[PDB]
Amino acid sequence: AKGIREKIKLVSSAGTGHFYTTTKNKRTKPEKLELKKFDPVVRQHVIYKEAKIK
C-alpha cells in the first residue's frame, strides 16, 4: 500500500483559486505530469494542473 513504489496520493490543485481535489496515482508508471479539469469554488472548470505538470 504505502510502499514508496506503488500507488500514492495526488494532492492535485488548480490554477489560481486555491482549490484541492484529490485522487490516487502511481510512481513507476509514467508520472511527473498531470492535469484535468474539475469544478472549482464556482464558475467554470479549466486548468487544475495539480502537482506534476506537463
Q: Are the CB atoms for 11 and 49 separated by under 8 Å? A: no
- The answer to the question of residue 31 lying near RNA (CB under 7 A) is yes
- The answer to the question of residue 45 lying near RNA (CB under 7 A) is yes
Q: How far apart are CA 54 and CA 42, in angstroms?
A: 25
Over the window 7 to 26, marking each residue x when it contacts RNA by CB under 7 A and - when it does not, the resulting string is x-x-x------x-xxxxxxx
Q: Are the CB atoms for 48 and 37 separated by under 8 Å? A: yes
Q: Catalog residues that contact RNA under the rule CB under 7 A.
A: 1, 6-7, 9, 11, 18, 20-26, 29-31, 33-34, 36-39, 42-45, 52
